[PDB]
Design a protein around this ligand. Structure first.
Ligand SMILES: CCCCCCCCCCCCCCCCCC(=O)OC[C@H](CO[C@@H]1O[C@H](CO)[C@H](O)[C@H](O)[C@H]1O)OC(=O)CCCCCCCCCCCCCCCCC
Ligand SMILES: CCCCCCCCCCCCCCCCCC(=O)OC[C@H](CO[C@@H]1O[C@H](CO)[C@H](O)[C@H](O)[C@H]1O)OC(=O)CCCCCCCCCCCCCCCCC
Ligand SMILES: CCCCCCCCCCCCCCCCCC(=O)OC[C@H](CO[C@@H]1O[C@H](CO)[C@H](O)[C@H](O)[C@H]1O)OC(=O)CCCCCCCCCCCCCCCCC
Ligand SMILES: CCCCCCCCCCCCCCCCCC(=O)OC[C@H](CO[C@@H]1O[C@H](CO)[C@H](O)[C@H](O)[C@H]1O)OC(=O)CCCCCCCCCCCCCCCCC
Lengths: 115, 90, 195, 48, 49, 69, 164, 60, 105, 418, 179
C-alpha cells in the first residue's frame, strides 16, 4: 500500500494507456490510407521546399519591382570561399538538396499488401 | 509529308534571373555551357580556377580509392594483375 | 509557476535524461566493440588451454602498462624499432615501391601529338604529384608551360576564352587586331568580316 | 500446402480490401479477355 | 557471389578530389645499411617488379 | 583542462607569422580562410611539442629499463 | 527505509536488467521490421546482450535469484530502484508467458499469416513496455503499468518483512 | 501556370512569344502520338486507319 | 464485374511490387517535375495540376505513359476525400475562372 | 558540422606532409591541438551571432547566348530560335483580393490539426477565456507565418526552415510538457500569467510542423493555386503593397469573425447539446465519469498527435543528417585496415544493408539468439527492409524475400514442434 | 545423387542468350515476339528481377550519365556527357570536355541508334553504333562555322543566314565498318 515518498513524481496509468493505444492506432492509420473515415494521416501541412520557393518568389519579385537586382536565398547556407572544388564551395545547399527524398518521406510502404 | 516522324523539341527546364543586357527580371531556359560548368567560378571580377574537382590522372593509391566509381579503366594499371592482363590480351 | 522556473526545471530534467541515456549508449557501444576479444578468450579456454587465457588478460594489462611507459614517461622500450619498420603509409609506398608505369595522366592516352617533355610534365602535374615522389618539392610544375601546352592542343577553345576576356574588358578591337584572327575568320566563314 | 495457402477462407480479408481498392477505378476500365487480346492485336497492326 | 554496384559515392573523410594518404599499409621499410642481419617482421612476398 | 590546455596550445601573432612564412610564401592576412587555419594549427602543434619536450620529458628520462611484456 | 532518489549507477544497472526481456523476445523482430523499416536498428542493438545472457544455461535463474534476494529485500537500497528491478523481473515473466503461448499454437493457425501477426505483436508489445519503463528509469521517476505495478508494490512490501 | 498539364494550365494565359507557342504545339503533337498508341475507338469511322485494321481482323 | 481468385492474386502481387514507387510527370514544355510519392500525387490531383491524361513514369515501365493507361495508379490516387476535394476544386474554383478568362480575353 | 570539421582536419594533416609529417591520423597531440582550436572558435562564433553576419543569398545572372549551351540552340525555318526569354509581367481587384482573403481564412480554421484539439480541450475542460486565448494564439502564429511567406521575408523564413530537427524537437518538448500538465487535472480559476501560458503554447505550436487528419480538404483554396500562400501578378511596387495588404487584411478579418462565432457558439448553444446528452439520452452515465472518459479521450488524441511522425522518418534523416552526412555516405561503408573487412564505425553499421550481407551472429564462439526463421539461409541477413529507391536483389529475389508462399516456406523452421 | 554426385562442366553450364538488338528472332508466340527475349539480358526482356532505374551519375572525371539503368549499369536509353576521361566504350582520343552522346545503351556501351555531338569541334554524327564503335549507315555534319560565329556574339538568325548554305553543301552520308 506504500507507493513512495510522494516527492518523487508518479506517472499515472492513464498516461501509459494513452501511449499504448496511440502508438497502435498510429501504426494502423499509417498502414491503411483512405480508410480514416475516407481520409489519411499526414505529419505536416506544407513541404519546406515549397514554402521556401514561395518565399523566394515573393522576395525576388518585390526586389525587382523596387529597382534592384534580385537575390536568391539558399536553404542550408551560402558559399564557402575556397579554390579546390565546386562541391566544397557549395556544400551546405548541396547537403540540404541531397536529403530531399527522405525529408519528404514516408519510410514505410505507401500501399497495402497481404502476405 | 515532313521528313521527321516526331517533332524535335528543346527539353530544358526554366529558371528566373537578371538579364544584364535587357536589364530586367526574366524567366529563361539559358543555362551555362557544359564545356566549362564545374571547372571555374566568378564571384568577383576575378575568376577562380579550381585545382582538383575533375581528377585528370590516376595512380595506384587513388585507383584503390576510386576502384568501383570510374566509368573506365585502362591497361596501364591493370598490367600488374595476371587475370586482368589476360582479359586485355587473350 | 513563473516562466523562468518552468524553463529551468525543464532544462534540468532534459539534461539528466540525456546524460543517463548517453551513459547507457556509451556502455552499449563498449559492449558491441569488445565482443570479439571476449569470444577469442572463451574459445581459448574451451579448446583445452585454460592457462593461455590468463596470459591474454595479463597481456592486456601489460599492454596498458607499456602504453603508459611509452607515451607519458617517454622510455624507449626496446624492440619498438622492429615494430616501426613493419608498417608504412600509402604515399610512402608510392614514393618507394611503385613503378612509374603504374600511373598515367589521362592526356597521354587522349593526345598522340605529345612529345616526351610534355608527357613528363603532365605526369608530374596529374599522375604522381610532389608528395608521391622521392625528390619532389612543391612548385615542380610551372603551370605556365602547362597552360602553353594546353593551349597548343585545342587552340580554338583558347581563342574563345581570349574573346570572352576581351569582351569582358573593352579590348575587342585589340582582339581582332591580332595577326591571325581575321585570317581564321576568313578560313572558317567563307566571307570576309564586314564589321 | 502451397495450394492450401491460397484457399478462399484463408484469403478472405484480402478479398475485402482488394474489392474496395479496385472499385475506386472507373467502370469502363474493366475489360474482357477478348477485349484485351483485341487491343493488343490492334497495337501491333498500328505499328506495322 | 553478390555482385558489386558501380555507383559513384559522396561524402567521406576527405573533401572531393583527394584520398586517404596517411592510411597504414602492412609493407616494410628498409634502411640503407644492413649488418648483423636477422629477418623481417613484415616480408616482401612479391619481390619482382 | 580546457583552459589549462588552451594556455599551452594557443599561439600569439609572431608564431602565426612564423608558421605562415615557411609553410606558405606569403605573410598573414593575405590567405584563404582554410589556409590560415593550417598555419594556426602548425604554430599550436609546435607549442605543444616544445612544451612536452622541455617540461615533461626533461626529467622523466632517467632510464629505468625494465617491464617488457 | 531509504526514500532517496536514484543516482546514475542504479540507473545503469536497471537499464541492463531491462534489456533482459528484449533478449527474450528478439527472435520475432523480423515480422515487425519488415512492415516498418524505421525501427530496423532494433534488429542489431541487443546482440552482445544476447551473448552475455546465454553464457550458461543457469545464468538467468541465477540473475533472478540474485536480484530478488540481494536488491529487492534489502531495505537500505532506495525504494524506486527496487521498484525498477522488480518491474524488470515482471516484464521478463510476461515475455516468458508469451513464449509459452506461442509454443502451444495449433498447427492450422501456425501455417497461416495469423502466426506472422502474432509474432509481430509479441515483439512490439514487449518493446513498447521496455521503452516506456526505460524512459522513466532514466528520468528517475515511478511509472505505473496497469495490472502490473500494484503487484510490484505488494511484492516489495512483502519481500521487505520477509525476515520477521 | 500555363505550363501545368492539368485543368489549371488551361485557364491561364500563354505569353505572346511566337517561338514558345511553336514549341508548345510540337510538344502537344508528340503527346498525341503517344496517346494514340494506347487508346482506341469502339466504333471507328469508315475511311480511317483503325477501320481498315478492324476489317482485316474480321477477314482473318 | 465478378473477379476470379486469379485476378485477386494478380492485383495483390502488383500492389506488392508498386508499394515503394516514386513517381514523376511531365508538363506542357516536356520538362519532368519533382519527386512524387503517393500523397504528393494526391495533392497535385486535387489541385488540378495533373489529371488522368498526364504522362507519368515509375518502376516497372520503360517509357512515359498517360496515367489512365498505367495499371493501378488511378485506384491508388482516388481516395474518397480526394474525389470530393477534386470535385469541389473543379466546380467552384477552376470552371468560374475558366469562364472569366474566356470572357476577359 | 562535425563531418566538415573532420574534413578540415584531414586537409590540414595532408598539407603538413611536406613540412612536418605526423605518425598517423589519430596522433594525440595533433588531435588535442585541433580539438582545443575548434572548440575555441566555436565558442567565439557562438558568443557572436553566426546566423547574423554570414552570407545566405546570391544574385542570379543569366548567361548570354555565347556562354550558354550552344549545341542546344537551333534555328527553326529561319527567324526563330529556341532560346526562350520572357518577362513575368481598377480598384475592383483590391476588393476581390479582400473577399478571397476572407474565404481562404475560412479554409484556415477547420479543426483538423493538433492546435485545434488543444483549443477544443480548453473550451470543454476549462472556461471560455481559456479557449479564447488558445484560439488567439493559433490566429497570431498562423498570421505571422502566413504574412512572412506572402511578403517575402526570407531573413526569417529560410534560416528557420534550415533548422529542421530542432523544430521537430521543439514540437516534441512542447507536446510532452502539455501532456504532463494535462494528466494532473489541476484546477485554479484563471490568472493573467496562466492566460499568457496557453497563448504562448498555441502560438509556438503554430510555428512547428503538426499532424493533420483531412489534409486535402484543409489545403484547398479559392482561386487557381495549390495553397493560400501564393502571390498575385502586379505591375509596380505600390500595387504589390496594396494587393497583398488587402489579401492579408481579408485573412485577418475572416479569422477574427470565426473566432467571435466560436466564442458565441461556446457560450449558449453548447448547453443545449450538453443537457440533451446528459438528460435526454437513454444511456445511464454519471457526470463525474463522463468527464473522466472525456479527459482520457483528449489525452489519447494529443498523444497520437505527438507520436505519429516517429515511423515516418528513418534514423538516417533524424540522426546522421544533423551530424553532417549525406545519404549513402562513404564513411558508412569505410572498412578499417584493408585486410580487415569490418566497418570502421559500428555505431551506424545497421544503415543500408543488403539481404546478401553476412550476419555477424554466426561467428564461432558467439552465443547469440536462436533465429529459426533464418535457419535455411543462415549465412546472410535474409530479410528485406529497404527504403525509397534503394532496393538491391542478387540471387535472393524479391519474391523469395517478401512474397507469398515462397517467403512463407523459407521460414518453416519457426513452426517445428521442437 | 542429384545434388552431390553431379557437377556441371565449364563448357556446358547454362548462360543467358546473346540476342544483340533483338531483331530477326523466331517467335514462339507470333503475336508477342518479346516473349522470345525472356532468356536474355536485353533491356526489353520481360521480368528481369530488379526494376530498371532512373540513374543520374556524376563520375570523378566529371563524365555524367542520365537515363535508364540495370543493376547500376547504363543499359537502356539516355544521355552521356563526357568529362576529362571517356565513357560508353568510346576511345580516349574521340571525346573532349563537354561532348555528348544521346541514344541507345546496352551493357554500358553505345549500341544501337544515336547521335554524337561535339561543341568544341562542331562534328555531328547521326546513325548506327555497335559496341561503341560507329558501325553501319551514318550521316556526318560540320556545324563549326555556326558554332564559331555564335561564340563571337552573333545572334543565331544572322549566324544561320551566314552559314547555312556552306553547312548544307558539306553533308556526308556514308557506311562505316568499325569506326
Ligand atoms: C530533448 C528531448 C528529451 C526531452 C524530454 C523532455 C524533458 C523532460 C522534462 C522532465 C522534467 O522534469 O520536467 C519538469 C516537469 C515537472 O515535472 C515534475 O512535475 C511535478 C508536478 O508537476 C513536480 O513539479 C516535480 O517537481 C517535477 O519534477 O515535467 C513535465 O512537466 C514534463 C514531464 C515529462 C513526462 C513525460 C510525459 C509524457 C509521457 C509520454 C510517454 C513517453 C514514453 C517514451 C516515448 C519516447
Ligand atoms: C563524424 C563521425 C561520424 C560518426 C557518426 C556517428 C553516428 C552517431 C550515432 C550515435 C547513435 C548510436 C548510439 C550508439 C549505439 C550504441 C550501441 C551500438 O554501437 O550498437 C551497434 C549497432 C550496430 O550493430 C552492429 O551491426 C552490424 C551489422 O552490420 C554487425 O551486426 C555488428 O556485429 C553489430 O555490432 O547499432 C545500433 O544498434 C544502433 C542503434 C542506435 C539507435 C539507438 C536508439 C537511441 C537513439 C538516440 C536517442 C536520441 C534521443 C533524442 C536525443 C535528443 C538529442 C538529439
Ligand atoms: C563545429 C565544432 C564542433 C567540434 C569540432 C569537433 C571535431 C573534433 C575534431 C576531431 C578530429 C578527430 C580525428 C579524426 C581522424 C579521422 C581521420 C580519418 O581518416 O579517419 C580514419 C581513422 C582510422 O584510420 C586509421 O586509424 C588508425 C588508428 O587505429 C591509425 O592510427 C590512423 O589513424 C589511420 O590509419 O578513423 C578513426 O580513427 C575513426 C574516427 C571517426 C570519428 C571521427 C572523430 C569524431 C569524434 C568527434 C567527437 C567530438 C565531438 C565533440 C563535439 C563538441 C561540440 C559540441
Ligand atoms: C534504447 C533506449 C531508448 C531510451 C528511451 C528514450 C526515448 C526518448 C525518445 C525521444 C523521441 C523523440 O524525441 O523524438 C520524436 C520526435 C517526433 O516528435 C514529433 O515530431 C513532429 C515533427 O514531425 C512534431 O514536432 C511533433 O510535435 C513532435 O511530437 O522526433 C524528433 O523530434 C526528431 C529528433 C530525433 C529523434 C530520434 C530518436 C528517436 C529514436 C527512438 C525511437 C524509440 C521511440 C519508440 C517509440 C515508439 C513510438 C511509435
Amino acid at each position: 500500500v506504500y507507493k513512495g515518498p510522494a516527492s518523487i513524481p508518479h506517472a499515472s496509468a492513464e498516461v501509459f494507456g494513452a501511449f499504448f493505444l496511440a502508438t497502435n492506432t498510429a501504426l494502423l492509420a499509417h498502414m491503411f490510407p483512405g480508410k480514416l473515415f475516407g481520409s489519411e494521416l499526414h505529419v505536416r501541412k506544407w513541404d519546406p521546399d515549397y514554402l521556401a520557393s514561395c518565399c523566394n518568389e515573393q522576395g525576388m519579385r518585390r526586389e525587382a519591382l523596387s529597382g534592384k537586382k534580385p537575390n536568391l536565398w539558399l536553404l542550408g547556407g551560402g558559399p564557402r570561399l575556397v579554390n579546390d572544388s565546386w562541391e566544397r564551395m557549395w556544400w551546405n545547399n548541396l547537403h540540404w538538396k541531397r536529403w530531399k527524398v527522405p525529408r519528404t518521406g514516408p519510410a514505410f510502404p505507401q500501399d497495402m499488401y497481404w502476405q | 509529308k515532313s521528313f521527321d516522324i516526331t517533332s524535335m523539341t528543346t527539353t530544358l527546364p526554366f529558371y528566373a534571373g537578371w538579364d544584364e543586357s535587357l536589364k530586367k527580371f526574366v524567366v529563361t531556359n539559358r543555362l551555362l555551357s557544359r564545356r566549362d560548368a564545374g571547372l571555374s567560378v566568378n564571384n568577383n571580377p576575378q575568376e577562380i580556377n579550381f585545382t582538383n574537382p575533375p581528377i585528370q590522372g590516376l595512380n595506384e593509391g587513388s585507383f584503390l580509392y576510386w576502384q568501383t566509381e570510374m566509368p573506365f579503366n585502362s591497361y596501364n594499371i591493370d598490367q600488374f594483375i595476371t587475370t586482368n592482363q589476360s582479359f586485355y590480351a587473350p | 509557476e513563473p516562466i523562468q522556473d518552468e524553463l529551468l526545471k525543464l532544462l534540468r530534467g532534459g539534461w539528466v535524461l540525456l546524460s543517463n541515456l548517453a551513459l547507457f549508449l556509451v556502455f552499449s557501444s563498449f559492449l558491441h566493440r569488445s565482443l570479439n576479444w571476449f569470444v577469442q578468450t572463451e574459445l581459448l579456454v574451451a579448446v583445452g588451454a585454460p592457462q593461455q587465457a590468463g596470459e591474454r588478460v595479463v597481456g592486456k594489462f601489460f599492454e596498458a602498462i607499456e602504453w603508459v611507459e611509452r607515451n607519458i614517461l617517454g622510455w624507449k622500450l626496446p624492440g619498438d624499432e622492429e615494430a616501426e619498420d613493419a608498417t608504412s603509409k600509402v604515399y610512402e609506398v608510392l614514393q618507394n615501391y611503385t613503378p612509374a608505369e603504374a600511373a598515367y595522366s589521362f592526356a597521354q592516352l587522349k593526345y598522340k601529338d605529345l612529345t616526351h617533355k610534355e608527357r613528363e610534365l603532365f605526369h608530374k602535374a596529374y599522375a604522381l604529384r610532389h608528395f608521391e615522389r622521392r625528390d619532389g618539392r612543391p612548385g615542380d610544375v610551372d603551370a605556365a608551360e602547362l597552360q602553353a601546352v594546353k593551349d597548343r592542343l585545342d587552340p580554338l577553345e583558347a581563342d574563345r576564352r581570349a574573346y570572352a576576356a576581351a569582351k569582358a574588358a573593352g579590348r575587342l578591337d585589340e582582339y581582332w587586331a591580332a595577326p591571325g584572327r581575321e585570317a581564321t575568320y576568313q578560313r572558317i566563314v567563307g566571307a570576309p568580316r564586314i564589321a | 500446402l502451397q495450394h492450401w495457402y491460397y484457399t478462399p477462407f484463408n484469403r478472405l480479408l484480402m478479398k475485402f480490401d482488394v474489392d474496395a481498392f479496385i472499385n475506386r477505378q472507373p467502370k469502363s476500365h474493366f475489360l474482357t479477355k477478348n477485349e484485351e487480346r483485341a487491343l493488343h492485336i490492334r497495337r501491333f497492326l498500328l505499328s506495322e | 557471389k553478390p555482385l558489386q554496384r558501380y555507383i559513384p559515392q559522396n561524402g567521406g573523410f576527405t573533401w572531393p578530389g583527394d584520398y586517404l594518404r596517411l592510411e597504414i599499409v602492412e609493407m616494410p621499410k628498409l634502411k640503407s645499411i644492413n649488418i648483423k642481419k636477422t629477418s623481417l617482421k613484415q616480408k616482401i612476398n612479391v619481390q619482382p617488379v | 583542462t580546457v583552459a589549462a590546455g588552451a594556455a599551452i596550445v594557443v599561439p600569439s601573432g609572431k608564431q602565426v607569422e612564423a608558421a605562415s612564412l615557411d609553410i606558405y610564401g606569403r605573410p598573414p592576412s593575405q590567405l584563404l580562410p582554410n589556409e590560415r587555419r593550417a598555419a594556426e594549427f602548425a604554430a599550436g602543434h609546435r607549442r605543444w611539442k616544445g612544451f612536452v619536450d622541455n617540461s615533461i620529458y626533461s626529467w622523466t628520462r632517467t632510464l629505468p629499463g625494465h617491464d617488457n611484456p | 527505509r531509504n526514500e532517496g532518489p536514484m543516482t546514475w549507477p542504479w540507473k545503469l544497472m536497471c537499464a541492463i536488467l531491462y534489456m533482459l526481456p528484449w533478449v527474450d523476445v528478439t527472435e520475432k523482430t523480423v515480422y515487425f521490421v519488415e512492415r516498418f523499416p524505421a525501427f530496423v536498428w532494433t534488429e542489431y542493438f541487443s546482440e552482445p546482450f544476447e551473448h552475455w545472457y546465454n553464457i550458461h544455461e543457469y545464468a538467468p535463474l541465477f540473475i533472478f535469484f540474485a536480484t530478488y534476494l540481494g536488491i529487492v529485500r534489502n531495505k537500505k537500497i532506495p525504494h524506486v530502484a527496487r521498484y525498477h528491478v522488480m518491474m524488470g523481473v515482471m516484464l521478463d515473466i510476461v515475455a516468458m508467458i508469451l513464449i509459452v503461448t506461442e509454443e502451444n499454437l495449433p498447427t492450422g493457425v501456425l501455417w497461416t499469416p495469423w502466426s506472422d501477426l502474432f509474432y509481430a505483436l509479441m515483439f512490439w508489445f514487449i518493446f513498447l513496455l521496455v521503452i516506456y519503463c526505460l524512459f522513466f528509469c532514466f528520468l528517475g521517476w515511478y511509472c505505473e503499468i496497469p495490472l502490473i505495478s500494484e503487484g510490484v508494490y505488494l511484492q516489495i512490501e512483502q519481500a521487505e518483512q520477509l525476515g520477521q | 501556370k500555363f505550363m501545368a498539364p492539368g485543368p489549371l494550365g488551361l485557364c491561364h494565359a500563354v505569353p505572346d512569344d511566337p517561338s514558345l507557342r511553336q514549341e508548345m504545339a510540337k510538344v502537344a503533337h508528340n503527346y498525341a502520338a503517344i496517346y494514340r498508341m494506347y487508346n482506341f475507338d469502339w466504333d471507328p469511322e469508315p475511311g480511317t486507319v483503325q477501320y481498315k485494321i478492324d476489317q482485316r481482323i474480321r477477314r482473318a | 464485374i465478378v473477379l476470379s481468385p486469379y485476378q485477386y492474386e494478380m492485383i495483390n502481387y502488383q500492389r506488392m511490387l508498386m508499394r515503394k514507387n516514386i513517381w514523376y510527370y511531365r508538363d506542357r514544355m516536356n520538362v519532368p517535375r519533382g519527386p512524387c510519392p503517393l500523397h504528393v500525387v494526391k495533392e497535385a490531383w486535387v489541385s488540378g495540376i495533373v489529371d488522368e491524361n498526364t504522362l507519368f513514369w515509375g518502376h516497372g515501365l520503360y517509357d512515359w505513359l498517360p496515367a489512365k493507361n498505367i495499371k493501378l495508379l488511378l485506384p491508388m490516387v482516388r481516395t474518397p476525400e480526394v474525389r470530393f476535394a477534386t470535385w469541389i476544386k473543379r466546380t467552384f474554383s477552376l470552371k468560374p475562372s475558366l469562364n472569366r478568362i474566356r470572357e476577359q480575353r | 558540422s562535425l563531418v566538415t570539421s573532420v574534413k578540415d582536419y584531414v586537409e590540414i594533416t595532408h598539407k603538413l606532409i611536406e613540412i612536418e609529417p605526423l605518425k598517423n591520423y589519430t596522433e594525440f597531440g595533433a588531435v588535442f591541438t585541433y580539438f582545443i582550436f575548434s572548440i575555441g572558435e566555436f565558442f567565439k562564433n557562438f558568443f557572436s551571432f553566426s546566423f547574423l553576419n554570414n552570407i545566405w543569398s546570391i544574385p542570379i545572372i543569366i548567361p548570354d547566348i555565347a556562354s550558354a549551351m550552344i549545341s542546344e540552340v537551333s534555328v527553326l525555318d529561319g527567324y526563330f530560335h529556341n532560346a526562350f526569354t520572357f518577362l513575368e509581367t481598377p480598384s475592383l481587384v483590391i476588393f476581390e483580393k479582400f473577399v478571397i482573403g476572407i474565404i481562404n481564412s475560412l479554409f484556415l480554421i477547420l479543426p483538423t490539426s493538433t492546435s485545434h484539439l488543444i483549443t477544443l480541450r480548453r473550451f470543454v475542460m476549462q472556461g471560455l477565456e481559456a479557449g479564447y486565448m488558445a484560439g488567439l494564439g493559433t490566429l497570431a502564429g498562423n498570421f505571422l507565418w502566413l504574412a512572412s511567406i506572402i511578403l517575402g521575408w526570407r531573413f526569417f523564413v529560410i534560416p528557420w526552415l534550415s533548422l529542421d530537427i530542432f523544430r521537430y524537437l521543439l514540437g516534441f518538448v512542447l507536446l510532452v510538457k502539455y501532456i504532463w500538465d494535462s494528466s494532473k487535472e489541476r484546477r485554479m480559476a484563471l490568472e493573467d500569467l496562466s492566460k499568457w501560458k496557453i497563448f504562448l503554447l498555441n502560438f509556438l505550436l503554430a510555428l512547428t510542423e503538426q499532424s493533420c487528419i483531412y489534409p486535402f480538404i484543409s489545403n484547398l483554396s479559392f482561386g487557381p493555386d495549390a495553397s493560400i500562400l501564393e502571390g498575385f501578378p502586379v505591375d509596380n511596387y505600390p500595387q504589390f503593397l496594396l494587393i497583398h495588404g488587402a489579401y492579408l487584411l481579408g485573412i485577418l478579418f475572416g479569422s477574427f469573425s470565426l473566432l467571435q462565432f466560436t466564442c458565441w457558439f461556446w457560450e449558449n448553444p453548447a448547453f443545449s447539446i450538453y443537457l440533451w446528452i446528459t438528460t435526454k439520452s437513454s444511456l445511464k452515465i454519471s457526470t463525474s465519469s463522463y468527464y473522466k472518459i472525456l479527459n482520457f479521450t483528449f489525452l489519447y488524441a494529443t498523444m497520437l498527435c505527438a507520436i505519429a511522425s516517429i515511423p515516418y522518418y528513418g534514423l538516417d534523416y533524424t540522426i546522421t543528417n544533423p551530424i553532417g552526412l549525406v545519404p549513402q555516405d562513404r564513411i558508412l561503408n569505410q572498412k578499417k585496415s584493408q585486410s580487415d573487412p569490418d566497418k570502421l564505425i559500428t555505431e551506424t553499421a545497421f544503415l543500408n544493408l543488403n539481404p546478401t550481407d553476412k550476419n555477424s551472429r554466426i561467428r564461432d564462439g558467439v552465443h547469440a539468439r536462436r533465429e529459426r526463421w533464418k535457419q535455411r539461409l543462415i549465412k546472410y541477413q535474409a530479410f528485406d527492409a529497404s527504403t525509397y529507391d534503394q532496393g538491391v536483389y542478387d540471387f535472393l529475389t524479391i519474391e523469395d524475400l517478401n512474397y507469398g508462399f515462397d517467403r512463407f516456406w523459407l521460414r518453416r523452421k519457426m513452426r517445428n514442434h521442437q | 545423387d542429384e545434388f552431390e554426385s553431379d557437377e556441371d562442366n565449364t563448357e556446358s553450364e547454362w548462360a543467358p542468350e546473346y540476342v544483340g538488338a533483338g531483331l530477326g528472332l523466331v517467335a514462339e508466340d507470333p503475336l508477342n515476339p518479346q516473349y522470345s527475349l525472356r532468356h536474355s539480358n536485353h533491356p526489353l526482356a520481360p521480368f528481369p528481377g530488379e526494376p530498371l532505374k532512373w540513374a543520374s551519375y556524376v563520375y570523378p572525371d566529371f563524365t555524367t550519365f542520365e537515363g535508364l539503368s540495370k543493376q547500376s549499369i547504363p543499359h537502356g536509353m539516355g544521355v552521356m556527357t563526357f568529362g576529362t576521361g571517356t565513357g560508353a566504350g568510346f576511345a580516349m582520343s574521340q571525346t573532349r570536355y563537354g561532348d555528348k552522346y544521346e541514344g541507345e545503351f546496352q551493357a554500358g556501351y553505345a549500341h544501337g541508334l544515336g547521335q554524337f555531338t561535339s561543341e568544341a569541334s562542331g562534328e555531328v554524327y547521326i546513325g548506327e553504333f555497335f559496341a561503341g564503335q560507329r558501325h553501319g549507315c551514318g550521316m556526318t555534319l560540320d556545324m563549326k562555322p555556326y558554332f564559331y560565329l555564335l561564340e563571337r556574339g552573333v545572334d543565331p538568325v544572322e549566324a544561320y543566314r551566314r552559314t547555312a548554305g556552306a553547312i548544307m553543301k558539306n553533308v556526308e552520308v556514308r557506311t562505316w565498318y568499325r569506326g
